[PDB]
Amino acid sequence: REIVHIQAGQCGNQIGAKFWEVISDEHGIDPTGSYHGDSDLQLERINVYYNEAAGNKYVPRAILVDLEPGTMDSVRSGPFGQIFRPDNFVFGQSGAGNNWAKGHYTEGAELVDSVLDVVRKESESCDCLQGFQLTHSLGGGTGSGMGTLLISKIREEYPDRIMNTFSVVPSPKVSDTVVEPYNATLSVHQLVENTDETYCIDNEALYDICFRTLKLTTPTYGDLNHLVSATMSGVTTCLRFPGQLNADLRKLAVNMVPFPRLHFFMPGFAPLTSRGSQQYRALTVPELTQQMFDAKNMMAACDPRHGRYLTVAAVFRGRMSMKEVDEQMLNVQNKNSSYFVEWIPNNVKTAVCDIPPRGLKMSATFIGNSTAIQELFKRISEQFTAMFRRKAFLHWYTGEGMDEMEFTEAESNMNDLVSEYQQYQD
Amino acid sequence: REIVHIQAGQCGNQIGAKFWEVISDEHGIDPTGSYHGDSDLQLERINVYYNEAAGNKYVPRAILVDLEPGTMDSVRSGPFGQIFRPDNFVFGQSGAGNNWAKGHYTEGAELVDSVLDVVRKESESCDCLQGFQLTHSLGGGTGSGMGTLLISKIREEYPDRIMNTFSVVPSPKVSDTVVEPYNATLSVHQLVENTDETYCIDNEALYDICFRTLKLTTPTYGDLNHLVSATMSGVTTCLRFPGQLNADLRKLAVNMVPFPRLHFFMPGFAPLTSRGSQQYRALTVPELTQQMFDAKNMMAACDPRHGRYLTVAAVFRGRMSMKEVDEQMLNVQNKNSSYFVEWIPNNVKTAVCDIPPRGLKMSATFIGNSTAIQELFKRISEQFTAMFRRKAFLHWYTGEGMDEMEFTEAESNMNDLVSEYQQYQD
Amino acid sequence: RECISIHVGQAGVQIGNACWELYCLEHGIQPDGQMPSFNTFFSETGAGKHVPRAVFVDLEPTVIDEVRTGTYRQLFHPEQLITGKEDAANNYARGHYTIGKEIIDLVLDRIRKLADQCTGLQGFSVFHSFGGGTGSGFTSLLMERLSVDYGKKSKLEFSIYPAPQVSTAVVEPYNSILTTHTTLEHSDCAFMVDNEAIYDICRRNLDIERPTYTNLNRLIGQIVSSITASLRFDGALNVDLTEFQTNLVPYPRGHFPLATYAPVISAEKAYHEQLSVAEITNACFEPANQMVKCDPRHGKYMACCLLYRGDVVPKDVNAAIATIKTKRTIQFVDWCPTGFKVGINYEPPTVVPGGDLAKVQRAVCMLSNTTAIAEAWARLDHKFDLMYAKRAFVHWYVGEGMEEGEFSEAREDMAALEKDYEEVGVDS
Amino acid sequence: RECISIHVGQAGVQIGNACWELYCLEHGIQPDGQMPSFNTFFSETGAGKHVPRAVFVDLEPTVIDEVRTGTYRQLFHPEQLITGKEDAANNYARGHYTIGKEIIDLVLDRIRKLADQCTGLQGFSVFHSFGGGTGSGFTSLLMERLSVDYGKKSKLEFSIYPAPQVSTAVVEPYNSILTTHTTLEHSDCAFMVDNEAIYDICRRNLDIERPTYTNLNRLIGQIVSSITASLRFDGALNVDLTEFQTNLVPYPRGHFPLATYAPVISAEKAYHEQLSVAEITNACFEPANQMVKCDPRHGKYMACCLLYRGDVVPKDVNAAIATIKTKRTIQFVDWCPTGFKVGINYEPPTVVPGGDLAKVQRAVCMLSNTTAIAEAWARLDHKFDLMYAKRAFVHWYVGEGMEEGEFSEAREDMAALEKDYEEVGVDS
Numbered sequence A, B: 001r002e003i004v005h006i007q008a009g010q011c012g013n014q015i016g017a018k019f020w021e022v023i024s025d026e027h028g029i030d031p032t033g034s035y036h037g038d039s040d041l042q043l044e045r046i047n048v049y050y051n052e053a054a055g056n057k058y059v060p061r062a063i064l065v066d067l068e069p070g071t072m073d074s075v076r077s078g079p080f081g082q083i084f085r086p087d088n089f090v091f092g093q094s095g096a097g098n099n100w101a102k103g104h105y106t107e108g109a110e111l112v113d114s115v116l117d118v119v120r121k122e123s124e125s126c127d128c129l130q131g132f133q134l135t136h137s138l139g140g141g142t143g144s145g146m147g148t149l150l151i152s153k154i155r156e157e158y159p160d161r162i163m164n165t166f167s168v169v170p171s172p173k174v175s176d177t178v179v180e181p182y183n184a185t186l187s188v189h190q191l192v193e194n195t196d197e198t199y200c201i202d203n204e205a206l207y208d209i210c211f212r213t214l215k216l217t218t219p220t221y222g223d224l225n226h227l228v229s230a231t232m233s234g235v236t237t238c239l240r241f242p243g244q245l246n247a248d249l250r251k252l253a254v255n256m257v258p259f260p261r262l263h264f265f266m267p268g269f270a271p272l273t274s275r276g277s278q279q280y281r282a283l284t285v286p287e288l289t290q291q292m293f294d295a296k297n298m299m300a301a302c303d304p305r306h307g308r309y310l311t312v313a314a315v316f317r318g319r320m321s322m323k324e325v326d327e328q329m330l331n332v333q334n335k336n337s338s339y340f341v342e343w344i345p346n347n348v349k350t351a352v353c354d355i356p357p358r359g360l361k362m363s364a365t366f367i368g369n370s371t372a373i374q375e376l377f378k379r380i381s382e383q384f385t386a387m388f389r390r391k392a393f394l395h396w397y398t399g400e401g402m403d404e405m406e407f408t409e410a411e412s413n414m415n416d417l418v419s420e421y422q423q424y425q426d
Numbered sequence C, D: 001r002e003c004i005s006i007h008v009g010q011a012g013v014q015i016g017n018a019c020w021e022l023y024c025l026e027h028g029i030q031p032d033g034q035m036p037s038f039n040t041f042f043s044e045t046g047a048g049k050h051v052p053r054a055v056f057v058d059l060e061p062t063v064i065d066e067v068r069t070g071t072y073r074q075l076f077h078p079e080q081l082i083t084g085k086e087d088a089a090n091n092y093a094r095g096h097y098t099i100g101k102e103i104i105d106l107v108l109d110r111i112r113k114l115a116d117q118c119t120g121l122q123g124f125s126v127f128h129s130f131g132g133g134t135g136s137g138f139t140s141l142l143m144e145r146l147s148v149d150y151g152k153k154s155k156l157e158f159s160i161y162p163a164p165q166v167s168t169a170v171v172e173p174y175n176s177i178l179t180t181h182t183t184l185e186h187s188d189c190a191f192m193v194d195n196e197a198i199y200d201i202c203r204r205n206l207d208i209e210r211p212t213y214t215n216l217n218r219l220i221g222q223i224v225s226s227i228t229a230s231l232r233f234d235g236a237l238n239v240d241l242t243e244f245q246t247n248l249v250p251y252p253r254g255h256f257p258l259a260t261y262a263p264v265i266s267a268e269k270a271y272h273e274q275l276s277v278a279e280i281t282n283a284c285f286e287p288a289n290q291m292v293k294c295d296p297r298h299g300k301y302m303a304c305c306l307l308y309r310g311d312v313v314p315k316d317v318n319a320a321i322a323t324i325k326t327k328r329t330i331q332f333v334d335w336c337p338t339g340f341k342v343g344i345n346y347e348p349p350t351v352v353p354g355g356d357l358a359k360v361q362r363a364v365c366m367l368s369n370t371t372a373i374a375e376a377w378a379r380l381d382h383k384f385d386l387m388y389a390k391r392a393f394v395h396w397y398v399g400e401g402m403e404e405g406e407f408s409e410a411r412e413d414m415a416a417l418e419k420d421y422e423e424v425g426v427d428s
């Protein structure tokens, strides 16, 4: 029944800053820590993410990890940085510098032991864990590097808990680190087989949505990470709150994974349009389904109609009829039958929660597992190869002891995921 | 049951500005978007042209298209530009410049894909489309050029929907573009066989009516496009509202087209006289029929008594007896038997609606298909030939890749319509 | 002893509106169905509400919506009110085939439901128009199914006869020709009236120069009630609908009895004038009260049925008949002796409050089958021919799957029909 | 004369919520249990509070908590409300085995406690869904134990039939196939309904285009009450649950009678319309009121049971039966003569205040076993096959200890079941 969340890397720490904000919004918990809500449900299932400390203080069940105090400090300095206890800030001193080898292989490795100890302390604080969630970037040093290391140890300690992670996937246009594909390649090599599932977030796609449908001209990462948190929070609240359908994360995982190795997801979100049009929108189930199916409302820079859909999850929040939902999902399946895989009859699955997100009447979360995902892997693998041949920045990595044959195997493994998507693309 | 309207070109955009104004007048819809009427019928069949968006907002089911933001902006700036959603403004940047080749063949072609996507989104928003209507100029770059391109694709997607268009036909005296007959020729070549029907509006004739019977000395295009919208709105309201006769657009199309290729129409309108005489007018069915038959009340610069009438539609709005209407139409047929074609017994058909246009007790719309129409084609074809031989401005067109043999075929096709009118003129 | 009314198309439904209004007027039926008091047409609920056993079909929502928003919306059961979304467009090709054929199954199942509600289905009658898309298109489609399921029940049709001078439907000849082909062969009897002729009646006998359809249909309703309400009510000679068929249809082709109705008199014209049974029947043989523009003197009679309301004594009727048989110029076909059906109901004639017709104490309806009808077909023949020779409007049918041969064929069937009239005209 | 209701899973419990609400409506039971007035289902306390003899199982706290916070939280005994912490995840492998198997012992002991409270346990019935983790997983686990301890008691199951078009559970075929394997062999009879078919009922007979599960379960509750409340109440022909089993199950396989219910009528549709017993039963043989999307005309009937509420006279029933036997197109299997069970209760039909269905004076429930069910299995066969051929999602079961052979086996058992339907279809 409970979940532990660990954030890492500057990305992960800033995403989590919005995530937790939202969760407390959902439950009426003040930036200082106490509960000042107003709904029974708000406290009722609070356990999944909060420990109530003496005084009616709620402690977010999460660990903030970094290798630079300053980022942690900036998190702590805002509202909701006060709700986190000092003991959840685990950090070192001297960066990682966006270096996998430092993060995973060497220096960051050193910190992980202290992180894990706190993890253990929290695992004991829970009655019964459902699972763990981690937030991070695929091409980052602590985000992926150190984060991955941690994941391998947590999974080891808890094989029976859900291990998932959401991660920022290097967008085709904006890479920061020259070896960002290298770090990503290494994380695939480690993560894929050490996780139950991973979500693919593309900032470029997010920037398109924010202007494309939301028509906004000023977003920052906090605004885009709001959208990220909308999908993350969407998933777990249902599990938390009363609904109609089947509201268990593990069951979601079961329904979305047809094969042990292909567990990559494309998140999307509805409704998600500018205020101008809000006066011209109608709120129906087909309306949400139109926004959910549309590739432009995906947060991943993929194109599901290019690939084939293996699995689709449609999560609904708010009062909807069962009939309408059933029929519209069927219609989707029918009309987009050319994209769905024939091996899975009725490949579109649903989940229904009766609690709407604060401020909306209804909402829906799109989760997909298509073959289209392989295109991201292909882009990375290719870029990787070029760098691999030149050893760009690999003296930094090999200087910290990372061996090229390990990287070679990582490359293969990327190619293996692509070939397996092809094996089920048919 | 529903209709989608697309406006294009500066002409089309300004005509539509009046058209939609009128439709909202008909239903009591405020310039800002909400419904503030007062009749049951006003909302009852609103679906054909409006989507009700959340908040009792009505969205006109139409797309505004241009290649210059400024025209679009001017439309948006007035009342009823606020009722259109931003998503219905599809435009590029850099004109067309009244160049078919740019509009259709090259640059405007690029935009059409985004237009069509929105079209598709609306086709899904409808329950059941009856058809589509487009407003444009025959000699214009985006009006005809880009507009035609769009039509060919919409027809392709929906063979089973009504495709009609109203278009400004180059008046003998006022052409703006030197190659306006060229653009028109090309549009015939493309449109005639890619449309179910097209209406022929002559501004010169309109300027004569406004002074001739309406005795006005200040009109602008908005006043003349009011008259245009009177005929357009006249047609669709009946379909929308309760009547006596047969109020379906498709049925109108069926009754007015005797031959697959000859579908050109001459709109006219009654009552349509100055206020002075309004104190000396009587309102009877023969009164309307006198105004309807009279060639001077036609909006097309043709002369129906010069040619032969193939089909006539008389649409009536307001309470009239069936007897009177029947008898007067018969009388018309009888007295003007020398103009009607002998192959069609009782060539004058009627349609009756019981709802009068706001402010009038009664009104009638004249729709005709005569052979006289061919005279317009003849004027254009001739002018075309001269230009064709000289290639006036064809370097602009051939510079954008338009081939002269395509134009040659276009010329033939114009001549073919004339010969077919002759074939049924007898 | 039950029957079903079927209203297809605007014409069918708007006429029906008048008809059911009149039946309400016949018994004092409230808009909600409450009747304080004719179960041959109506089905009773435990609230004492009665439901008119009828089906309303329109492929365009509007007219049925007109019903749904009027007073009689409470009377009609929502399932009786059947509507599609799109029209036939004046066109058999869509009415009978492409469009109407999709909904007809529903329609039939509502009919069958009512047929199961009937305990002794005597039969039914269909109200429509010869020129329209649903009016004639869909209509024949229905007959195609009803004649299978209800093969032994009365199949009476009532249709508006296309006015020779005014018609709003350019392909009406084509529609009507196709219906001939398909209705002749399926239906038992089709009756028709001409709105133009009716206008002349309104202006000459009612003195009204402003008739609308809402006037025109009241007059039609009168005629219909004489044969529907009053034939179920008590009289001397209680004539049934099956009896009507058995007394009006002489051949297995169709036949097409035309309506004539006298009295049609304005209130002022009723003053200062005393009608007798005989005088009313004199009026019935006058061209002037002929409800179809076709000259009674042109053709020869084959059938004739006179149905009486109110103060009618058979004694007087007998005398009247004697004079119409011998005094008039009514030529009749050899085949027939003058066995004219006399229906005599004690049930008085009724008048619509706020209507045009005067309160009368007695009334006579006349049905007649005359050879002059072939001229009506001749009208259609040429109108069809003209269009068909040019092939004007042909693409509006061809695109729906119609065949040109079929159209020729249908014309030929009409020609055959005309020839059979020719045959009957030849006395033998 | 007692029985136990068992509600497993959300579907089981939320349906149960409607069911127990209806039983409260049947007798005027207050949320606190106070009843001023059916002890076959209820156990009485000295306060006059009655406890519904039922067990509620959910492995996720939430739904039971919904009960615990609602009005009926006072009605239910805290021990009846059993909850785990974690879910089955749509998965038999956890529902039947890994997770649900841990709590089941508690569950059984509460059942046994109630069995000891029963003095004359007639039997019980289990509410669940064919696709879910607890809905079908745990459910069969329970049957495995209940069939030992209560081997001679009624083992009736009610389950939601997976909609062919909409399903939220991607491995539902796999779940349902595994249940077939284990339920066929243990249960006595399983009934099922299709929410999609129900939606069609709601939109056509109730005229509602917005059904939620809270509507859908009211309708289910109606059907259930007819066979649960009214079978314990007085009538002409008082039919027991054991009698139901003894009159509905023809073979030792299972059988799966499907529900049909007529009247399902909106208040406005009830107006202007008079239903008789015969008319209601006519509706019962219409595909249109079939609660499962499976065509009654496709298969052949094997069993049929009609249960009557309110104003039903056997006299009329007899006539109705005569016509359904002879008028309809109902083909039936040789084996069977038409001995259709007629249950006739004087107990009137009841309606939920604020519900959609009209107050009716009489009502008929129909159970039927048709050969068309094999097509439902065919649907599952291919859905299973597709997944299984690719081995999509297989790791979610394998990791819990499931065997691939087992899955093949279960499919084969289904195939055998289909073959037995084939057999029955062959007349002999």
Ligand SMILES: Nc1nc2c(ncn2[C@@H]2O[C@H](COP(=O)(O)OP(=O)(O)OP(=O)(O)O)[C@@H](O)[C@H]2O)c(=O)[nH]1
Binding pocket: B244, B245, B246, B247, B251, C008, C009, C010, C011, C012, C014, C015, C087, C088, C089, C090, C091, C095, C129, C131, C132, C133, C134, C135, C136, C160, C162, C163, C167, C168, C169, C195, C213, C214, C216, C217
């Ligand atoms: N007497 C009478 N004739 C009518 C009435 N309404 C229409 N008609 C006539 O019937 C014909 C009109 O048919 P429409 O209304 O065009 O068509 P429809 O038969 O309802 O079916 P669609 O073509 O598909 O709309 C014309 O000949 C009219 O003169 C009416 O209320 N009374």
Ligand SMILES: Nc1nc2c(ncn2[C@@H]2O[C@H](COP(=O)(O)OP(=O)(O)OP(=O)(O)O)[C@@H](O)[C@H]2O)c(=O)[nH]1
Binding pocket: A244, A245, A246, A247, A251, D008, D009, D010, D011, D012, D014, D015, D087, D088, D089, D090, D091, D095, D129, D131, D132, D133, D134, D135, D136, D160, D162, D163, D167, D168, D169, D195, D213, D214, D216, D217
């Ligand atoms: N009629 C009806 N069907 C329902 C209801 N709730 C769910 N269902 C259907 O039953 C199935 C859903 O099962 P779930 O809710 O996912 O699962 P569960 O069986 O409760 O058990 P878990 O999978 O472990 O949560 C779907 O086919 C739903 O359409 C309900 O209240 N009424």
Ligand SMILES: Nc1nc2c(ncn2[C@@H]2O[C@H](COP(=O)(O)OP(=O)(O)O)[C@@H](O)[C@H]2O)c(=O)[nH]1
Binding pocket: A008, A009, A010, A011, A012, A014, A015, A096, A097, A098, A099, A137, A139, A140, A141, A142, A143, A144, A168, A169, A170, A171, A174, A175, A176, A203, A221, A222, A224, A225
């Ligand atoms: N959405 C999102 N992406 C971020 C944020 N911060 C850094 N990123 C992305 O993360 C990548 C850089 O890795 P970084 O987080 O600096 O690595 P680390 O800090 O060394 O673990 C780039 O692709 C950025 O676009 C953020 O707050 N939101």
Ligand SMILES: Nc1nc2c(ncn2[C@@H]2O[C@H](COP(=O)(O)OP(=O)(O)O)[C@@H](O)[C@H]2O)c(=O)[nH]1
Binding pocket: B008, B009, B010, B011, B012, B014, B015, B096, B097, B098, B099, B137, B139, B140, B141, B142, B143, B144, B168, B169, B170, B171, B174, B175, B176, B203, B221, B222, B224, B225
């Ligand atoms: N009635 C009418 N004609 C117009 C309007 N605007 C331009 N026109 C006519 O359209 C022709 C010019 O084409 P234009 O609309 O400028 O082409 P485009 O804008 O490049 O697509 C001329 O014959 C004008 O008389 C208008 O608002 N009303």
Ligand SMILES: [Mg+2]
Binding pocket: A245, A246, A247, D009, D010, D060
């Ligand atoms: Mg559940």
Ligand SMILES: [Mg+2]
Binding pocket: B245, B246, B247, C009, C010, C060
């Ligand atoms: Mg009509």
